[PDB]
RNA sequence: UCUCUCU
RNA sequence: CUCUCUCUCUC
RNA sequence: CUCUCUCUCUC
RNA sequence: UCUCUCUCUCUCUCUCUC
RNA sequence: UCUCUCUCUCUCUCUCUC
RNA sequence: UCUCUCU
């Protein structure tokens, strides 16, 4: 049981080491200095170069249908250099085959797609913490208020099962609803070989959505949605109902700390063997890495570097939809809602005035650290029954409804509504779990927060 | 009929006396004082030394494949000494042959494996009362909520039939499911001489599981599981069904009070001849031994000694999965569920700060005493799943089992006048792990 | 139909997969025993290889051998006579193989599964060869049965390990002999039918009575078997009653399945030739065995002063399980006259240890038939109601006496007296040509002896 | 076949276990009677030991001896003449033994099992010896049968305790004589065939008639024996047809099983040599008895003026039950001419009390045969039809066509040696 | 000269 | 019937 | 309901 | 000669470049 | 992508009283 | 790891 855990840690560390040494090689090939190599924007550009080089289907499409005034075999992006204290942007072009060769040499001749998926999740978390997706929500017919379920909405299809665990209930519902809308518009959807392929995709997406849900009624309803040969308006409405139900009876969304490649590259250049030490995306390793890492960023004139650092921290730990109170408790500084952040996105546009732009250090440090969870809370585990030890008269208790429900009407909407009506926004989940100090590597002594003072806000996008 | 009972008591007392005099000899050889000899952690270390010395197969494997920076012929453990009121831990190493010689001399030149199995059951009960096994449950595909059937999950294979009676339905189902999973992955399982041996093991484990069950339908279903030449997914699912059915139509799991060796050693040094008086693991003897025994333990800073004492009491009487109401009635103090116990495990890790650690006396005393039972209560065509489901559907969590049986006062040695509890006041919790 | 095509296709693939395993296993064993093409195609060598497999998977006998080992023979090794041709002369050397080694080789050939269907297929092939070669009248008399009912002795040498598949191919006479031996042991041993074992024997007795009952066709015969089954302590009354049942089967023949189980050498040669039985499928009652034998060349050991054609006819008879079939029909299908057993100038196929393996020569077996027919699981030899479709005032007729009619020994005797040895059975069904793979145009024959064992 | 190989191997082990018990028990009794190697190999000693065991397990006679004790003999002790050679000369002393002690020794030698097969095997050996030595025309004349059918008296001395196995080896004449005694008892006693005991007698009469019917071969003989069985009150008429059936057996011979039951001394010697009959197996109709006798040395007590060769021939014939066989075939198998009974200069093997055990010397028995053959349970090939059948029968029809005699070195019986053939009647 | 409803 | 039966008796 | 039951593999 | 109350780590691979 | 009125002209079976 | 057409 311990051996499997140590191999898992070694494999994750291998992925991290590959990403870091690729970043070091890219910094060497780009002639970036230490400061320029630690800039988050340069790392964003380099990661996007990697992702676009290995986007096989898009590359093939670009070869078949060339873009306007662009070579389909070259990637690029903005690389920022400091000359005499002034920042300037450059568009430098790299062959896709060269990028692929460098990445494979970084991973010891292997095209490790796990690191690519890691960078993809990092970008998705950053986009989730920065930009809202209300327009896409409204277009598909879902309420703009279920933004908390839209984690991982920018993750592309090539992420696969690794990225599927990260995307929330809202994004899966949105994709299924898009499929149903396409089927409603054109009946030739779900017909032909493409029809068989899209039916398989629909079944697989419904199955992973079902795995996301926790209560039996939600699983039964998504099962009923999956069983329809030609899903129409009814299944789209049922999906919307399930998405709204996910606000109270939450789902199992996997949260991982995917740091920018600059941190990994600095760690690998420092001499940290992730293969020997081991890495975990849900434990203390990202926190320990972020505490002793220095990252720089570009601050547009009249912006608050503290707000940008908070945004990057939230993106790194995928805490965009987290309660502001617990996020502030872990960070030690107030996590300000999105409305009151005097900052724009991390990425710099091509039309910006690259003469008033400044540079600031990012405060990616937290007082406490906590375990990142897949669970969405308790829906209402333990000991169901008693095993008698003493020969005493006594009633022998057991949880009869829970035992029987595994051994047994067809309208589960009423049951779901009843379950959500029973719930109150005051129940305590994750009982007995707390936040650990940075020195508590083994997570032995937890600290439970007491939020029973004057009330701060709780929703980042509120 | 009485003569056989008195010989059984004499044999059990012989085992207890051997364990106690071994503990006395070990305390003499370790230069432990009385307080240090009564510490539960030192007794845990000594018992683990005994078990590792006599773990023949592991010792042979260690000789063939040496461990990293360890002598395969030496056992050890943390021994705690008090100097100027400050506790300090020491790692002292003892030859395995020396430990075996001392143990055999304790049992009069005999390698009494019964005492080793007794210590094994004590450790298993402590682990059951302290640590939950939900990860192993989920890995094997069983619900994490059938923890009440996982009694004796940490018992090693060398316990045999004595330890097999103690392990519950959940652990046996889990082991059978592991075997089925191994067979599913590799077809060379159940083939060859190893295949014949593992088929024999599977049949024996199925037979003792069948003996565990009470109703005829459960026995028929486990019989059908046993009869399959190549058990696959269907038998694993049927085993899961039987495990879930065991929550309502419970099984026959044997409960024994296996005390730490410190209590036995103190009793033997006091002058209690277990051979002449006789010992029973299901009667008043463990209660009477625990009432007049003093045990010390190490309390980490910011812990409740009452909660640790309750944990040790539950471990001693194997009441981990017991109803909290009856356990509190027998103890006289509220048995708090695991979630609200402000205490960690008994054992101290090697990385702990051995300068803020304190010592506390363990309150292993109960107001009443009760007989420990093997029974799981009263239970009242070729597809017996439907029949089992019907039987469980008939049952309600209000039926009274063990009718006419009560808890006896400590002075009632012969168990003559029972006391029946009336739990008909405001409801406390009932599940320890809830 | 139109739904049983799928089921027919499923069965063909499953049998083809079994045939593939036998061929794949034979090829592996041939390369491991170091046998050339000629020796690989020898029927005697294939017999030894097949018997080695059957003994390696005999769990019960192997256990008994371990507990009570024989003298000089360890119960973990099997083997048999392997015949090799060196310098033109033939020599026999006894090969010893570990049963675990043979079991692993067989399992590896069938993709790691036990595949007892392949073993039962080989056991049926041995039973067919035994039936066509040797006549067991001594067992018939020893059990008290009349030695004249040799036509019902189909599969009398099949071991009990062949259940279902073996039981379907075995005949009424063999089934009755099994019942009689159970009865005799009960009469001799009073403990029989009593105790824990008596319960096991009773269930075994019930099961084989039911399968025997399903073998019969007339209602009178089935009712007679049903009575015998009910007897809690069977004795002489059931002994005589079953004897009457066997005698009745000569006229009111039961349903005995007939399958063409070929030697493993034929399958091995076919599989080595790239032939894929699993893909195109197979059938033991269709044209597949006939087409395989046409293209297959098999050699055998011929003892001095033995007609090679007569041995080839014996192997041909065993291949198609036509030992008890009419000589005229067998002669028509083969194209060359089939001779009775008394006029066959040959001994058994299997060569004995005490035989001088120096005057022995090998010959090719002529296992080719001019025609091909479908093997039958049947023996020899209207509307009574109405279902209205229109709403009219008519009266719905039914044959009342016949419907209520279906709600011993004199009746059976009356049935056989009416029967005569001239009734035409299988009316309109004939024999096809090898080029006619779809059974489109039957060729009805027009027909001096007709008894092989006469 | 190919399925009866397992059955044959199973039967061989069961017979070998019986012989092992016989050999093991003899070894113990020799060690417990304190018999030397020479005395243990004496055929007279082996018979005495065998007779002690058979009487020790005779429940009915033992019960009658208890209820009605004999004069000077307690019914709980058995024994016989044991011949011991010390100082060159032979002497006989009666040994007395508890029947229960003998029973325990026999049972312990058979792993605690009764092993009634071994006792019957010894009983068949004694019958074979009696048949070759003594001719019982007195019983034939007393029962009303013509004394000329002495060829059908095979196993006439076998006790009724040997059921199944005993009945298989006994002949038509013995079966007829048993029935004739039943008829004579019924005719004399009117209460016979009536009452509770009459029912028991009727079932015995039916069962022994059934085995006689199975002993016959021609359909005519079976039907007539079927008629005799159906008689509820058999009398003189059933007397006659049984006599006629016996006379027909001289021409239309029945199927009588022939087994080679050797003396216990041979088995004891073989077991002491380490031979494991259970492992190697045994058979009473195959080569095993012949191969055992070739390597076995046994001695006998010779009365003065007696030819050792004739006594050895008598033992050889009794061993293989060739008392009523053709002398030419017996001579061909043995290799030395077999002499008829009238020309044998020897008396019975057993020595009587009234015989002076002082002029008696011992000789080695030549129980070795040049050839070996397989013992047969078969013969060769209303009432007017029966007489018609035996009229067509001639004493020249060849039987067992193509079946011959093999060599001791040919253990698989691969190459038969067909004989080509002046008397042929032992009792003639 | 003993004790017990209900593996 | 070239081997394929025998666990005993009107006990 | 106590007791001997002894362990497929170090796990 | 080890540690732990209370499944969340890991391979899952992509209907279409979107 | 077959054929047939009217008793099996094709529909196995995943081995044994282990 | 045996042998046999046909009491
Ligand atoms: C079990 C499972 O596998 C099941 O699944 C189901 C689903 C899938 N499918 C799909 O996708 C498809 C199909 C199809 C078809 C159809 C449809 C409908 C109806 O009704 C009919 C049909 O038919 C058919 C098909 C296919 C093929 C064939 O052959 C036939 C489609 C079309 O058609 O196009 C598509 C898709
Ligand atoms: C009564 C009782 O005893 C029964 O039991 C049963 C079970 C046991 N077994 C086991 O475990 C085993 C077996 C085996 C075998 C087999 C299998 C399967 C089949 O099919 C066949 C067979 O065969 C055999 C065997 C063994 C031995 C011999 O000889 C043969 C195994 C293997 O094989 O490996 C294992 C186990
Ligand atoms: C065998 C059967 O029957 C069962 O048994 C048991 C029960 C009944 N009982 C009897 O029988 C007996 C008993 C006894 C006893 C007694 C007697 C008398 C008196 O008084 C007392 C007593 O005690 C006792 C007993 C037993 C046991 C115990 O524990 C006690 C006897 C004697 O003793 O002897 C006999 C018989
Ligand atoms: C299989 C089942 O039973 C589970 O398993 C796990 C848990 C329990 N345990 C066991 O069994 C074992 C352990 C071990 C170990 C040890 C021992 C001793 C000492 O001292 C130390 C140690 O350490 C460790 C281990 C394991 C793992 C880790 O990680 C650490 C063993 C050895 O070592 O051999 C065996 C068994």
């Amino acid at each position: 049981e311990r051996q499997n855990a140590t191999e898992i840690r070694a494999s994750v560390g291998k992925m991290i080491d590959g990403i870091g040494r690729f970043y070091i090689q890219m910094c060497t090939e780009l002639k970036l200095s230490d400061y320029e190599g630690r800039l988050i924007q340069n790392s964003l550009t380099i990661e996007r170069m990697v992702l676009s080089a290995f986007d096989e289907r898009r590359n093939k499409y670009l070869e078949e249908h060339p873009s306007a005034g662009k070579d389909p075999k070259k990637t690029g992006g903005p690389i920022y250099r400091r000359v005499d204290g002034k920042w300037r942007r450059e568009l430098i072009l790299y062959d896709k085959e060269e990028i692929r060769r460098i990445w494979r040499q970084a991973n010891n001749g292997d095209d490790a797609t796990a690191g690519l998926t890691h960078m993809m999740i990092w970008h998705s978390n950053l986009n989730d913490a920065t930009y809202q997706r209300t327009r896409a929500l409204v277009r598909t017919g879902m309420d703009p208020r279920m933004c908390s379920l839209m984690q991982g909405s920018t993750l592309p299809r090539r992420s696969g099962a690794a990225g599927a665990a990260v995307k929330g209930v809202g994004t899966m519902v949105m994709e299924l609803i898009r499929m149903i809308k396409r089927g409603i518009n054109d009946r030739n959807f779900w017909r032909g070989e493409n029809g068989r392929r899209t039916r398989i995709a629909y079944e697989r997406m419904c199955n992973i959505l079902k795995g996301k849900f926790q209560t039996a009624a939600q699983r039964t309803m998504v099962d009923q949605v999956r069983e329809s040969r030609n899903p129409g308006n009814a299944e789209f409405e049922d999906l919307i109902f399930l998405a709204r139900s996910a606000l109270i009876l939450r789902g199992s969304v996997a949260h991982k700390s995917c740091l920018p490649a600059c941190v990994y590259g600095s760690a690998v250049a420092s001499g940290y063997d992730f293969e020997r030490e081991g890495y975990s995306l849900v434990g203390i390793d990202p926190f320990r890495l972020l505490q002793n890492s220095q990252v720089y960023s570009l601050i547009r004139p009249n912006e608050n570097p503290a707000h940008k650092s908070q945004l990057v921290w939230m993106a790194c730990h995928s805490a965009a939809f987290e309660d502001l109170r617990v996020s502030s408790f872990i960070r030690g500084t107030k996590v300000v809602p999105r409305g009151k952040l005097s900052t724009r996105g991390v990425q710099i546009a091509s039309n910006e005035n690259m003469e008033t732009m400044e540079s600031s250090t990012l405060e990616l440090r937290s007082r406490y650290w906590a375990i990142r969870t897949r669970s969405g809370g308790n829906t209402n585990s333990g000991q169901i029954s008693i095993q008698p030890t003493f020969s005493v008269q006594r009633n022998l208790p057991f949880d009869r409804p829970t035992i029987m429900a595994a051994f047994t009407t067809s309208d589960m909407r009423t049951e779901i509504i009843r379950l959500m009506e029973s719930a109150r926004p005051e129940d305590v989940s994750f009982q007995g779990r707390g936040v650990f100090e940075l020195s508590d590597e083994k997570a032995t002594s937890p600290i439970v927060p007491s939020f029973d003072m004057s009330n701060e806000g709780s929703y980042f996008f509120g």
Side-chain angles (χ1 to χ4, degrees), chain A residues 188-200 203 229:
Chain A
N188 255 6
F189 214 83
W190 323 101
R191 293 182 183 174
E193 302 266 19
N194 258 265
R196 185 182 295 276
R197 293 166 135 288
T198 192
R199 186 56 212 200
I200 282 159
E203 289 227 34
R229 297 294 181 192

Side-chain angles (χ1 to χ4, degrees), chain A residues 51-247:
Chain A
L51 296 183
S52 49
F54 278 97
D55 192 353
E56 241 307 4
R57 305 259 178 93
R58 166 150 199 285
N59 295 351
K60 158 161 304 309
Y61 169 50
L62 282 188
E63 297 202 45
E64 304 328 350
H65 306 57
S67 177
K70 278 152 181 37
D71 201 18
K73 325 189 93 52
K74 293 172 117 51
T75 53
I79 283 293
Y80 306 92
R81 301 217 159 75
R82 188 160 60 163
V83 167
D84 264 331
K86 281 296 154 333
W87 291 94
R88 68 193 59 254
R89 109 197 303 267
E90 202 177 44
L91 201 57
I92 65 74
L93 305 187
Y94 253 98
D95 265 26
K96 286 169 187 272
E97 77 164 339
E98 188 87 8
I99 298 293
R100 286 191 290 268
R101 168 196 88 79
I102 292 175
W103 171 258
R104 270 172 209 137
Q105 181 180 304
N107 299 333
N108 291 352
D110 179 23
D111 51 355
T113 64
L116 313 179
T117 311
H118 189 81
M119 290 179 253
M120 271 156 83
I121 294 172
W122 145 244
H123 288 161
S124 154
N125 289 347
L126 182 62
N127 269 305
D128 292 339
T130 314
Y131 301 113
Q132 228 164 319
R133 299 270 287 154
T134 172
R135 186 145 317 101
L137 280 155
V138 174
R139 187 216 263 120
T140 65
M142 299 170 20
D143 226 14
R145 307 199 223 91
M146 33 183 79
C147 65
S148 88
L149 326 159
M150 305 282 330
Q151 193 201 310
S153 44
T154 50
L155 263 182
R157 276 150 82 249
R158 36 173 157 123
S159 36
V166 178
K167 54 189 44 168
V169 176
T171 79
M172 305 280 309
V173 163
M174 210 173 66
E175 272 146 42
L176 292 173
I177 286 190
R178 287 212 203 101
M179 269 168 118
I180 307 316
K181 291 299 206 43
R182 278 174 188 157
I184 277 166
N185 305 350
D186 194 5
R187 198 134 142 98
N188 255 6
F189 214 83
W190 323 101
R191 293 182 183 174
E193 302 266 19
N194 258 265
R196 185 182 295 276
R197 293 166 135 288
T198 192
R199 186 56 212 200
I200 282 159
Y202 175 76
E203 289 227 34
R204 181 228 314 150
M205 290 168 81
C206 273
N207 272 333
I208 58 194
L209 176 62
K210 180 183 176 192
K212 223 151 277 296
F213 277 135
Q214 263 168 320
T215 86
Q218 285 165 313
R219 293 157 103 86
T220 286
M221 206 160 126
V222 59
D223 231 356
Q224 283 174 11
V225 171
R226 172 168 68 68
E227 290 313 310
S228 81
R229 297 294 181 192
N230 193 40
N233 175 277
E235 277 75 16
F236 142 82
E237 296 246 317
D238 278 25
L239 278 174
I240 281 186
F241 178 93
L242 271 191
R244 171 165 256 108
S245 84
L247 291 163

Side-chain angles (χ1 to χ4, degrees), chain A residues 292-340:
Chain A
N292 54 55
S293 83
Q294 45 175 5
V295 172
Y296 303 92
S297 158
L298 293 183
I299 289 288
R300 326 181 206 231
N302 280 321
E303 266 198 354
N304 208 353
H307 293 154
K308 181 153 286 198
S309 58
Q310 167 205 311
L311 191 133
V312 174
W313 184 90
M314 293 189 57
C316 281
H317 294 294
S318 73
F321 309 117
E322 188 66 4
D323 201 342
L324 286 203
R325 325 177 280 168
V326 54
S327 280
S328 320
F329 196 65
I330 292 173
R331 180 158 165 75
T333 318
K334 295 198 37 43
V335 171
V336 162
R338 182 75 178 91
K340 323 203 72 49

